[PDB]
Design an enzyme around this catalytic site. Structure first.
Site, PDB file in Angstrom:
ATOM      1  N   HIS A  55       0.845  -1.248  -0.048  1.00  0.00           N
ATOM      2  CA  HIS A  55      -0.051   0.033  -0.007  1.00  0.00           C
ATOM      3  C   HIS A  55       0.860   1.374   0.013  1.00  0.00           C
ATOM      4  O   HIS A  55       0.361   2.372   0.458  1.00  0.00           O
ATOM      5  CB  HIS A  55      -0.970  -0.070   1.180  1.00  0.00           C
ATOM      6  CG  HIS A  55      -2.126  -1.005   1.304  1.00  0.00           C
ATOM      7  ND1 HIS A  55      -3.392  -0.900   0.842  1.00  0.00           N
ATOM      8  CD2 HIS A  55      -1.877  -2.415   1.655  1.00  0.00           C
ATOM      9  CE1 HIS A  55      -3.994  -1.929   1.040  1.00  0.00           C
ATOM     10  NE2 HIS A  55      -3.126  -3.057   1.500  1.00  0.00           N
ATOM     11  N   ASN A  76     -10.192  -2.777   2.948  1.00  0.00           N
ATOM     12  CA  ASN A  76      -9.952  -2.781   1.457  1.00  0.00           C
ATOM     13  C   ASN A  76     -11.197  -2.601   0.694  1.00  0.00           C
ATOM     14  O   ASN A  76     -12.314  -2.556   1.467  1.00  0.00           O
ATOM     15  CB  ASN A  76      -9.242  -3.968   0.733  1.00  0.00           C
ATOM     16  CG  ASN A  76      -7.813  -4.132   1.195  1.00  0.00           C
ATOM     17  OD1 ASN A  76      -7.119  -3.116   1.603  1.00  0.00           O
ATOM     18  ND2 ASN A  76      -7.481  -5.294   1.104  1.00  0.00           N
TER      19      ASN A  76
HETATM   20  C1  HEM Z   1      -7.925  -8.247   5.615  1.00  0.00           C
HETATM   21  C2  HEM Z   1      -6.538  -8.362   5.210  1.00  0.00           C
HETATM   22  C3  HEM Z   1      -5.635  -7.036   5.203  1.00  0.00           C
HETATM   23  C4  HEM Z   1      -6.291  -5.662   5.014  1.00  0.00           C
HETATM   24  C5  HEM Z   1      -7.777  -5.364   4.581  1.00  0.00           C
HETATM   25  C6  HEM Z   1      -5.282  -4.841   4.947  1.00  0.00           C
HETATM   26  C7  HEM Z   1      -5.179  -3.706   4.668  1.00  0.00           C
HETATM   27  C8  HEM Z   1      -4.007  -2.397   4.425  1.00  0.00           C
HETATM   28  C9  HEM Z   1      -4.136  -1.241   4.176  1.00  0.00           C
HETATM   29  C10 HEM Z   1      -5.309  -0.249   3.750  1.00  0.00           C
HETATM   30  C11 HEM Z   1      -2.868  -0.651   4.496  1.00  0.00           C
HETATM   31  C12 HEM Z   1      -2.320   0.819   4.192  1.00  0.00           C
HETATM   32  C13 HEM Z   1      -2.555   1.528   5.496  1.00  0.00           C
HETATM   33  C14 HEM Z   1      -2.174   3.169   4.901  1.00  0.00           C
HETATM   34  O1  HEM Z   1      -2.896   3.803   4.010  1.00  0.00           O
HETATM   35  O2  HEM Z   1      -1.144   3.794   5.534  1.00  0.00           O
HETATM   36  C15 HEM Z   1      -2.046  -1.575   4.968  1.00  0.00           C
HETATM   37  C16 HEM Z   1      -0.745  -1.925   5.050  1.00  0.00           C
HETATM   38  C17 HEM Z   1      -0.056  -2.736   5.620  1.00  0.00           C
HETATM   39  N1  HEM Z   1      -0.404  -3.908   5.794  1.00  0.00           N
HETATM   40 FE1  HEM Z   1      -2.413  -4.603   5.735  1.00  0.00          FE
HETATM   41  N2  HEM Z   1      -3.996  -5.767   5.365  1.00  0.00           N
HETATM   42  C18 HEM Z   1      -4.518  -7.036   5.153  1.00  0.00           C
HETATM   43  C19 HEM Z   1      -3.583  -7.992   5.575  1.00  0.00           C
HETATM   44  C20 HEM Z   1      -2.207  -7.854   5.963  1.00  0.00           C
HETATM   45  C21 HEM Z   1      -1.460  -8.776   6.718  1.00  0.00           C
HETATM   46  C22 HEM Z   1      -1.879 -10.433   6.976  1.00  0.00           C
HETATM   47  C23 HEM Z   1      -0.202  -8.095   7.102  1.00  0.00           C
HETATM   48  C24 HEM Z   1       0.862  -9.132   7.750  1.00  0.00           C
HETATM   49  C25 HEM Z   1       0.657  -9.854   8.560  1.00  0.00           C
HETATM   50  C26 HEM Z   1      -0.416  -7.036   6.899  1.00  0.00           C
HETATM   51  C27 HEM Z   1       0.708  -6.077   6.890  1.00  0.00           C
HETATM   52  C28 HEM Z   1       0.738  -4.954   6.451  1.00  0.00           C
HETATM   53  C29 HEM Z   1       1.920  -3.672   6.730  1.00  0.00           C
HETATM   54  C30 HEM Z   1       3.192  -4.166   7.207  1.00  0.00           C
HETATM   55  C31 HEM Z   1       1.466  -2.549   6.119  1.00  0.00           C
HETATM   56  C32 HEM Z   1       2.217  -1.407   6.171  1.00  0.00           C
HETATM   57  C33 HEM Z   1       1.853  -0.367   7.336  1.00  0.00           C
HETATM   58  C34 HEM Z   1       2.793   0.754   7.487  1.00  0.00           C
HETATM   59  O3  HEM Z   1       3.867   0.785   7.105  1.00  0.00           O
HETATM   60  O4  HEM Z   1       2.058   1.606   8.330  1.00  0.00           O
HETATM   61  N3  HEM Z   1      -1.544  -6.440   6.136  1.00  0.00           N
HETATM   62  N4  HEM Z   1      -2.813  -2.862   4.893  1.00  0.00           N
END
Ligand code: HEM
Ligand code: HEM
Lengths: 727, 727
Positions: A102, A175
Site C-alpha cells: 500500500h 480494502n
Molecule cells: C484483510 C486483510 C488486510 C487488509 C484489509 C489490509 C489493509 C491494509 C491497508 C489499507 C494498508 C495501508 C494503510 C495506509 O494507508 O497507511 C495496509 C498496510 C500494511 N499491511 Fe495490511 N492488510 C491486510 C492484511 C495484512 C497482513 C496479513 C499483514 C501482515 C501480517 C499486513 C501487513 C501490512 C503492513 C506491514 C502494512 C504497512 C503499514 C505501515 O507501514 O504503516 N496486512 N494494509
C-alpha cells in the site's frame, strides 16, 4: 524580487471551484474555514511563509541563497559554508522507507457522525450519540506498487480510516473487496512476494499479470475468491469515491452489559459504484498516472466531498456456526441476502492536507488500534496483522514515538510510564516512570472497565485445544464463494472478468501455469473456464468438462449486492464532461449545455486543438482548459460536441480519435447540429443508436438524455459494436 | 509436493535466447559461465536454494510453513511462534529509503578495457594498459520519479558506472545530456523541489509538465540549455543502449610528471542514437512502465550486450580561458566541432544481476570517488556534489559501512584505522586503531605519490580571491548554447522540440508562467518562440519580435553531433519486429522473413488475436508470443504482416489499430501479398509510399527494403501525413 503577477492570478481563490479552474493548493489556504477538532489541533505545527525572512533551521537569516561560499568567484567551495551544508544535508535525508504494501495512496481529512446511539450493541464512545462528531483522516491506496507507481492499475484498493475518538484512536483498516486472498498471516510474505515485482529484475510494477502471481494462485486455491474480485471491474475503480470498502474480518462489538456481537464493517459510497474498463484503465496509467489522487483532491476543492455510509453486518454469538462457511475465514464473504448491512453513520471527507509528506506519507494506521466497545476474533489472518503494523512502523517512521508525529496524535489525553526513544517530543514531568509507585501517588492510574470512559478489558472468549500449527478444516473450501460472485455479475461484468483473466494469463510466460489456472477455473464454473481457455488457445479435457460445480452458499444462487451495476446506484454529481470546441461555437448550444451540467453538479472541460482562447458566434471569449491530446477522453465521463464551425475540427485527427476512444470505452457521446458529421467517424447508423445523443441543437431534451446516460455510467449495450473499432 | 512440470519447462535454458522466448532469470543461473573479477568475488555471498531445507535465519528447519501456531486449530495465535515472528519481522523491514533523485534505475555487470595506454596524459591505472580489464557495474536511471515510477517518461537519464580498479573504485557519475540545469550546488534542492511532485498533493509523478518546474525555469534562465535537451527527443530515449552519456563537468587528468589536462567524459552508444516520439513514449508508460528495464535485461539475455565507447574531450591548461563560455560552467557544452572526442576504450555490459534489491537498489556511486591520475576542478555544481553523495548514503544504506555491502566492495585491498559503525562486517586484528603508532609499527602506512601505485595527492592549483558567495560573471550568459543546440537539430527534431514545450506548457495552469517561458524562448530563437506561442494561443509583442538572437558559440552556427539523427548511426542488431499472424500463414513468407531478420540479429515477436498456437499452410505449429492488445506496436521497432488467410484478421479491430499506431509513430511497416489490403486502414497510396514495404511475397528485396528502413530508425518523411490519422 517581484515575482508574483501584479494581477494576483498566481493565487487560487479560497472558495470551492471546479476541477481545472484554478491551481490546486494546500487545504488550509484553499479552505481556511473548514475545521474539525483534529485540524484545529494541527495548528500548533503549521508553518506560514508570507512576509517571513528565509533562514537556516537555527533561525539565522540568509543573505544569498543562490551561491556557495568559495575562495574567489571561480574558486573552490569552502568547508565553512554552514548554510550550504544544512540545506544540502536536509535535502540529502528527505526520504523515508515507503510502506511495504500500500505504498501508493491518497488521503484527506473529514468527519464522522452516527445516525443514532448504538449503546445497546457497543459501548464504543464514538458511536454512543448522533451529535458526537468524530474527526477522521482517510488514506486510499493500491497494494502492490511503490509510492511512485500509477493509480489506475488493476489491483485491490486499501481504504484506511483513522477515527480520533474521545477514548482513543480507532483505525479501521480495510480494502475495497470483502475478502482477502489468503487465510493465515504466516503466508502473507509468500503471497506478497508472489504479487510484487519479481526479485531478479524487479518487474513488473503495479501488476499481478506475471508468472509468480499466477503460479502462487494456481497452487493456493484459497486465493481464488479475491482473484475473481480483482479480475472483475472492481479491480479498476473510476475513483476512490465510487468503490465500496470493507473491514473484511469478523470483529466483535461489546456492549456495557458485556455481550459480544460479531460484526463485519462496510462503507457504502454515496456517489455510487463505478469502474473503468481495462483498456481505458491501462492507457490512463500512462496518460495520467496520478488520476485517482488528482480526482480526489479536486473533488474536495470543488465541494464534491467524498461521502460514505458506515454499515454493520451483525451476527449473534449463537449463530457462529450456522453458515456453510466459517465466519473467521477471511476468504469468505457474508452474503447481504443472508445478513443485511445495517446503516450506522456517515463519513464526509471535506479538506485536503497541507503537506503530502507530513500528513499522508507519515500517517500510520493499525487494525490493532481498537477502543473499549470493540474486540478481536480468532480470524488467523487478522491475528497476525496485530503483530505486523507496529513492527513495520519502527523502521518506516524511525522509532517508537510515531504517535507523536502530528497527524498520528490522539486528540484525547494520553499518559503512561513509557519514556525516551528516538525523536521523543513529549517532556515528562512525572517523578515516576514506573507503576506501582508511591512518589507520584501512583498516577497516572489504571481504570476499571465500565459503560463509559473505563479501561480496556478483553472479552473472555473460551479457548480450548492443543498448541498446533494447523489450518481449521472448516476453512478447507475454495470454490463456492468464487462461483457465487460470478453468478451474481451481469453478462457484461462476466465478460470483463473473462477478459481480465485472459489478458493476465497471456502475460504468464510458462504455459503450464496458464493451464493450471484454467483447471482451477473449471472447478468454479465451466462457462468461465471455457471462455478463458478459448482466449488462451487451451482446450479443456473431458474430465475438466465433468467437474461438478461447488454447492450454492446457504442456498443462494446469486446475490445482486455483489455486482457493481445490477442495481442502479448512479450519481452524476462530481463527474466531468469533455466539450470539444471549434473556432466559432454556437453559443446557444454552449449555454444550454453548461447550465444543464451545472444544475446536476457535473463539471466540464473546454477542449481545443491549441491553448488560449476561441471566440463564440456572439463574441463570447472562451478560455481553453486543455488540448484534445493533453486531456484525453480517458479522463472524462462523457463527451459533448456543440454546433459551430465544425469544418474547423472535422479533419483534426485528435478530435476524431477523441470520439473513437470515448466510444470504445462505452462513454455517452452527444452531438449537436453539424457535430453529427462525426457520426461517420464512429460508424453510427443514420437512424441513431442508444448511447449516442443527437439533435439539431443542444436544447430541450438533448441535455436530459445525455444526463440519463451519465446516470447509468456506461453504455454496456455497445460492447458488441466496439470490437470492430480500430481504436 | 510439488513441482515443476515433468517436462522441465519451468526453467529457462542457460544460453542466449531472444526476447520473450523463455522466462528471464537471475544472471548467475542464465549465464553461469560469464565471469569477471567482481562477479567472481561476489560468489562468497551468493546463496543457492535447490536441494536445501527451508529454515529460519538461525538455521532451524521449518516443518510447517503454511500456518501460525495457535491454541486449537480455530484458536488465537500464540506469542511463542518465533518462526512466524522472524518471518513477518523480516518482511516488515524490507524497505529502505529510495534515492533522493534517480530513484528509478536499471543495472548490469560488465567490463571495460582501454584501446591504448594513456600514460602520457594520466597515471590512472585502469587506463594504463590495453590488456588490463576493469570490471564495471552500471546503473541507468530517470531523475524525477520514484523507484516504482515509469521508464519511458520525458526526463533526463542518469548513466553511472562503477569501475573496480586496482588502485581503487572510480565512479563516473554522468547523465545523457552534456550539461546540467543549474550552475551552483546550493540551488540543487531548489531545482529538484521544482521538478519533483508538488508538495501539497504529491503530483505529478515522472513529469516536468507542471507549474512549479516552469515557474523555476522562467525565473532562472541558466536552466534553458538542459531544458532544450529535455524537450527534444533526447528526453525520451528508445533504450539505455541508444543514448549518449556524459560526465558533464570538466575534471582533470594528471600524468606521472604532474601535468594537468582538463577533460570532459563521453560515452558513445555503439548501438547508435535513437529515441521514441512523445505520443509513443507517454502511451508506453501505461502499456509497459518497465519497458527500458525489461529491454535492457533481455538484450543482455539475448547476447545483444550494450556497448559504449569511452571518449575524452581534452583541453590543455593554457586554453582554459579561450572559449566564449567558461569551461567550469556546467550549463555549457564543449562543441565537438571545437574540441573533438578522442576515443579511449570500450565498455561491454554482459551480465544481469542475481537479485535486484541486493545489487541494484543498494549500489552506491559517488562522483567524489576518484583515483590517482584524475582530479577535480572548481566547477561549483561538481564542488557541492562532492559533499552530498556520502552524506545521503549514511541514511539510505543505514550507516558508514556501505562500502562493505557486496556490490559496493572494492576488489583491490583496503586497510585503514576506521572502526565500528552500524552493521560492521570487517573484523580488524590490528592492535592499533590510530596513526602514528608504534605498537603495529605504523601499519597500515601512508604511500608517497608517484607514477604507479602511489598515494593520492591533489594537483596544486593556485587559489586566489576573497571568501565570497558569488556567481562568476563569466557564467552569466544563458541563450547562446540553447540556440546552438536548436540550430543543430534537423527540421523534424525542431518540430518535436516545439511540441515538447507546447505540450508541457499546456499543463501549466497559471497562464503568466507560460507567457514568461515564451518570453525566454524569444531570447533564444524567434522561430522556436513563435511556433510555441502559436500552439499556446499567445501572441508575441513587437518588442519580443525584436530581441536580438545571442551570438554564435565561437563562430559556430551549428554542430551536427548535437543532433540525434543528422549523421546516420543506425544499428539494427537487438531491434525487434512484430509479426501479425493469421490462422493459415504462408510459411514461405515466414521463412524468408525470419531468415533475413536472423542474419542481421533482429528479433521477432509472433502476435495473434489469442494465445496458444496457430498452424501455417505447411503444418508448422507456431507458438504465439502475445496478442495484438497484449504487446502493442509501442514495444517494437517495425511491423511485418505475412500473407495467408488475411480474412481471419482483416476485420480484427486490434490488428487494424496495431498498424495505425505503428504508422502514426513513424515505424516501418511491411505488407506481403493479401496483407496489402491493410493499406486501406492506413489510408495510403495505391501506388505505394516511402516507409511502406509491399510486394506479392516476402521475398528477396522485400526484407532488404525493410531492414534499410529499420537502420534509419523512423520514417520522418511521413510526419506531414500522420496528423490526419485518428489514432
Ligand atoms: C484483510 C486483510 C488486510 C487488509 C484489509 C489490509 C489493509 C491494509 C491497508 C489499507 C494498508 C495501508 C494503510 C495506509 O494507508 O497507511 C495496509 C498496510 C500494511 N499491511 Fe495490511 N492488510 C491486510 C492484511 C495484512 C497482513 C496479513 C499483514 C501482515 C501480517 C499486513 C501487513 C501490512 C503492513 C506491514 C502494512 C504497512 C503499514 C505501515 O507501514 O504503516 N496486512 N494494509
Ligand atoms: C552534472 C550534474 C549531476 C549529475 C550528472 C548527476 C548524476 C547522478 C546520477 C546518475 C545519480 C544516480 C546514481 C545511481 O544510479 O545510483 C545521482 C544521484 C544523486 N545525486 Fe547527482 N547528479 C548531478 C548533480 C547533483 C548535485 C548538484 C547534487 C547535490 C548537490 C546531487 C545529489 C545526488 C544525490 C543525493 C544522489 C543520490 C545518491 C545515492 O542515494 O546514492 N547530484 N546523480
Amino acid at each position: 524580487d517581484s515575482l508574483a503577477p501584479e494581477d494576483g492570478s498566481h493565487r487560487p481563490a479560497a472558495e470551492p471551484t471546479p476541477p481545472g479552474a484554478q491551481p490546486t493548493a494546500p487545504g488550509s489556504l484553499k479552505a481556511p474555514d473548514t475545521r474539525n477538532e483534529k485540524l484545529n489541533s494541527l495548528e500548533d505545527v503549521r508553518k506560514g511563509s508570507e512576509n517571513y525572512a528565509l533562514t537556516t533551521n537555527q533561525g539565522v537569516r540568509i543573505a544569498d541563497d543562490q551561491n556557495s561560499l568559495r575562495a574567489g568567484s571561480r574558486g573552490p567551495t569552502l568547508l565553512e559554508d554552514f548554510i550550504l551544508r544544512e540545506k544540502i544535508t536536509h535535502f540529502d535525508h528527505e526520504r523515508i522507507p515507503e510502506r511495504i504494501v500500500h505504498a501508493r495512496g491518497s488521503a484527506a481529512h473529514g468527519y464522522f457522525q452516527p445516525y443514532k446511539s448504538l449503546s445497546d450493541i457497543t459501548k464504543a464512545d464514538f458511536l454512543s450519540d448522533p451529535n458526537k462528531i468524530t474527526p477522521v483522516f482517510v488514506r486510499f491506496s493500491t497494494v502492490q506498487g511503490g509510492a511512485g507507481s500509477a493509480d489506475t492499475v488493476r489491483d485491490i484498493r486499501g481504504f484506511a480510516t483513522k477515527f480520533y475518538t474521545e477514548e482513543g484512536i480507532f483505525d479501521l483498516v480495510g480494502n475495497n473487496t470483502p475478502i482477502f486472498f489468503i487465510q493465515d498471516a504466516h503466508k502473507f510474505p509468500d503471497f506478497v512476494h508472489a504479487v510484487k515485482p519479481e526479485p531478479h529484475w524487479a518487474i513488473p510494477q503495479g501488476q499481478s499479470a506475471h508468472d509468480t502471481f499466477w503460479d502462487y494462485v494456481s497452487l493456493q486455491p484459497e486465493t481464488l475468491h479475491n482473484v475473481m474480485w480483482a479480475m472483475s471491474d472492481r479491480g479498476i475503480p473510476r475513483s476512490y469515491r465510487t468503490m465500496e470498502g470493507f473491514g473484511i474480518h469478523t470483529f466483535r462489538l461489546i456492549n456495557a452489559e458485556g455481550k459480544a456481537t460479531f460484526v463485519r464493517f462496510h462503507w457504502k459510497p454515496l456517489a455510487g459504484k463505478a469502474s473503468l474498463v481495462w483498456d481505458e484503465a491501462q492507457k490512463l496509467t500512462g496518460r495520467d498516472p496520478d488520476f485517482h489522487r488528482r480526482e480526489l483532491w479536486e473533488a474536495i476543492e470543488a465541494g464534491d466531498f467524498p461521502e460514505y455510509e458506515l454499515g454493520f453486518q451483525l451476527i449473534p454469538e449463537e449463530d457462529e456456526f450456522k453458515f456453510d462457511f466459517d465466519l473467521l475465514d477471511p476468504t469468505k464473504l457474508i452474503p447481504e441476502e443472508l445478513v443485511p448491512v445495517q446503516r450506522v453513520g456517515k463519513m464526509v471527507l471535506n479538506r485536503n492536507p497541507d503537506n503530502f509528506f507530513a500528513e499522508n506519507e507519515q500517517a500510520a494506521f493499525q487494525p490493532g488500534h481498537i477502543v473499549p466497545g470493540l474486540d478481536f476474533t480468532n480470524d488467523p489472518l487478522l491475528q497476525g496483522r496485530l503483530f505486523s503494523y507496529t513492527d513495520t512502523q519502527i523502521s518506516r517512521l524511525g522509532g517508537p514515538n510515531f504517535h507523536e508525529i502530528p497527524i498520528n496524535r490522539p486528540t484525547c489525553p494520553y499518559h503512561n510510564f513509557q519514556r525516551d526513544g528516538m525523536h521523543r517530543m513529549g517532556i515528562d514531568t512525572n517523578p515516576a516512570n514506573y507503576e506501582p509507585n508511591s512518589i507520584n501517588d501512583n498516577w497516572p492510574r489504571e481504570t476499571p472497565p465500565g459503560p463509559k470512559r473505563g479501561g480496556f478489558e478483553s472479552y473472555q472468549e473460551r479457548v480450548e485445544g492443543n498448541k498446533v500449527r494447523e489450518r481449521s478444516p472448516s476453512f478447507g473450501e475454495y470454490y463456492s464463494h468464487p462461483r457465487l460472485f460470478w453468478l451474481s455479475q451481469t453478462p457484461f461484468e462476466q465478460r470483463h472478468i473473462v477478459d481480465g483473466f485472459s489478458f493476465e494469463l497471456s502475460k504468464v510466460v510458462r504455459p503450464y501455469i496458464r493451464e493450471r489456472v484454467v483447471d482451477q477455473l473449471a472447478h468454479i464454473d465451466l462457462t468461465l473456464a471455457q471462455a478463458v481457455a478459448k482466449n488462451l488457445g487451451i482446450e479443456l479435457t473431458d474430465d475438466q468438462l465433468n467437474i461438478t460445480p461447488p454447492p450454492d452458499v446457504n442456498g443462494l444462487k446469486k446475490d445482486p449486492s455483489l455486482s457493481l451495476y445490477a442495481i442502479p446506484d448512479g450519481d452524476v454529481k462530481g463527474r466531468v464532461v469533455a466539450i470539444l470546441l471549434n473556432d466559432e461555437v454556437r453559443s446557444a448550444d454552449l449555454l444550454a449545455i453548461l447550465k444543464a451540467l451545472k444544475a446536476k453538479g457535473v463539471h466540464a472541460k473546454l477542449l481545443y486543438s491549441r491553448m488560449g482562447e476561441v471566440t463564440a458566434d456572439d463574441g463570447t471569449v472562451l478560455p481553453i482548459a486543455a488540448t484534445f491530446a493533453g486531456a484525453p477522453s480517458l479522463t472524462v465521463d462523457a463527451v459533448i460536441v456543440p454546433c459551430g464551425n465544425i469544418a474547423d475540427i472535422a479533419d483534426n485527427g485528435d478530435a476524431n480519435y477523441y470520439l473513437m476512444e470515448a466510444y470504445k470505452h462505452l462513454k455517452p457521446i452527444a452531438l449537436a447540429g453539424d457535430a453529427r458529421k462525426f457520426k461517420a467517424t464512429i460508424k453510427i447508423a443514420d437512424q441513431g443508436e442508444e448511447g449516442i445523443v443527437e439533435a439539431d441543437s443542444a436544447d430541450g431534451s438533448f441535455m436530459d438524455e445525455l444526463l440519463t446516460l451519465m446516470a447509468a455510467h456506461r453504455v454496456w449495450s455497445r460492447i458488441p459494436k466496439i470490437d470492430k473499432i480500430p481504436a
